[PDB]
Design an enzyme around this catalytic site. Sequence first.
Site, PDB file in Angstrom:
ATOM      1  N   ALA B  94      -8.052  -2.847  -5.774  1.00  0.00           N
ATOM      2  CA  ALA B  94      -6.922  -2.288  -6.503  1.00  0.00           C
ATOM      3  C   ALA B  94      -5.610  -3.024  -6.262  1.00  0.00           C
ATOM      4  O   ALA B  94      -4.619  -2.739  -6.933  1.00  0.00           O
ATOM      5  CB  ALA B  94      -6.756  -0.832  -6.122  1.00  0.00           C
ATOM      6  N   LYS B  95      -5.613  -3.943  -5.288  1.00  0.00           N
ATOM      7  CA  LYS B  95      -4.447  -4.724  -4.902  1.00  0.00           C
ATOM      8  C   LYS B  95      -3.179  -3.888  -4.942  1.00  0.00           C
ATOM      9  O   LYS B  95      -2.199  -4.226  -5.601  1.00  0.00           O
ATOM     10  CB  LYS B  95      -4.334  -5.950  -5.777  1.00  0.00           C
ATOM     11  N   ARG B  96      -3.221  -2.785  -4.214  1.00  0.00           N
ATOM     12  CA  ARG B  96      -2.104  -1.855  -4.131  1.00  0.00           C
ATOM     13  C   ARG B  96      -1.116  -2.348  -3.102  1.00  0.00           C
ATOM     14  O   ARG B  96      -1.493  -2.911  -2.073  1.00  0.00           O
ATOM     15  CB  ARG B  96      -2.598  -0.454  -3.746  1.00  0.00           C
TER      16      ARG B  96
END
Lengths: 292, 292
Positions: B94-96
């Site tokens: 999700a590359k949050r």
Amino acid sequence: EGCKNFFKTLDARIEAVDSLLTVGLDPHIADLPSPATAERAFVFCERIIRETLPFTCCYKPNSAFFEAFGPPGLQALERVCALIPDDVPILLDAKRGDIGSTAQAYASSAFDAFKADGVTVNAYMGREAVRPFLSYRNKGVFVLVKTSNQSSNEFQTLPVRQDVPLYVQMARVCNELAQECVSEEDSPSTTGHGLRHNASGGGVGLVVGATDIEALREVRKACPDLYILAPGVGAQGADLERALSAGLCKDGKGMLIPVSRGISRAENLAAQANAYREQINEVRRGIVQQYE
Amino acid sequence: EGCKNFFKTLDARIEAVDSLLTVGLDPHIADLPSPATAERAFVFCERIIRETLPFTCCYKPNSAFFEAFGPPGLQALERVCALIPDDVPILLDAKRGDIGSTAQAYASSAFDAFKADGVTVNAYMGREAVRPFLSYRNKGVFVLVKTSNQSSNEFQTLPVRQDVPLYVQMARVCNELAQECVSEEDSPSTTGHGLRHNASGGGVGLVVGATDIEALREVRKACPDLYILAPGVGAQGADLERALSAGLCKDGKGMLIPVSRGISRAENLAAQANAYREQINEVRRGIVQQYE
């Protein structure tokens, strides 16, 4: 008129209600009636919109708080966005950042599905992570430059290759990117702040914390026309008058002040919203008066 | 045994099925039967899991493709994650990346709601964006260091302050962060790769593109024990044998090879999955044999 956009709609809204106040829609579990639910998150955001609307120029829901409730949380997000009027821009704070193919899907999510007018983006991976969002020509794309948190003084302030801080190089790339997406429009502009946005009301924005006055000054110098979203006021105890002075453009615009808890926790949401609005306006009066 | 984690479960799965293959679950609209839907995205991911399971050590669904279908898309994501067995780690890509308060909500989303075992994170905003995920002590937290795309050579490779590339400083911070979250465990380790993970099977991971061999070599040197997720194989035509040689640890582990389209588009998913598995294994044989 299903031609709602970010910047042109924004400018009209700013002039219509006389405000640069952006209202965050952040349903923290801790602030919701127990036991918290996605439905309660919706009601929370509804009341906020219902009460602060007359003083607000833009609504900024933060995706993380909705994502915390799972699918029902996103079901609530969609309903919250659909609740906001056509004359008020919706800036989805999702800080999305991935490669082309994948960023195209985040873009579609934000615009086709959730129907936001703008979105926050993380450019650590370079311009390939920002362009896909900009293909939606009427949308606002806000890139993280120098954030309001403490840890921003860990990578963002690192000297890069007379050396400049990383966040400054980030700003220069954003400005170069803004210029790249408005390269086919008559130049110079006939109104001035020409890189602010394109003919469709879309364009590049910047996220710079109000907490760091120097950063605002530096970013503004690299990107004179672009809009700056300046989180920090209220919660992080940022100096509001000093922030606006550093980041506002000559015309008293080009800057958005987002507030969440500062408002949501207030005894009277509407009154508090207006208080920040007016507070912001006192500064705008000065800025615009010096050059006349 | 509801004690499923990331790294300990991973190591057992790696040894059980003899694989470092990570299978991406990316339902691109273009690859789904028309007209695409969240339901069709589910079926797509189901068939993939059903067929590649015996050769896979980890499943990596990318959130963007699910987010593209709105709430029903996340409803599908939840169902996809729930479909994966208890002995196979789920790495949510999700590359949050956001501040404390907010990152805590993304963490809860990934772990409490979607029930992933690991997640991808963007650290442009510093360590305050990674720690909240690490509070979930049995989870894998993979930080973006040097990505596989082209634009990674725009910020990530910038010389920082004998100067080092930004991605290298990013790795050093990650290693320092790994050491910070395992600081109370008996040191040195009794098994060796002690910073690989903690007693709960949680820990810090790194995302470094297989496409850049130099980067893998540099990152490994800064972080000798940590796991590296190396996207690039297949789609981006990365050199697989050269990548593993640069990033694998002495024990033939510490590295995950994710493949999406390389598999999903194959005539036979299961056969293709195994092909990469075996291909990867040929390299692991050599690495482990040199030191015996």
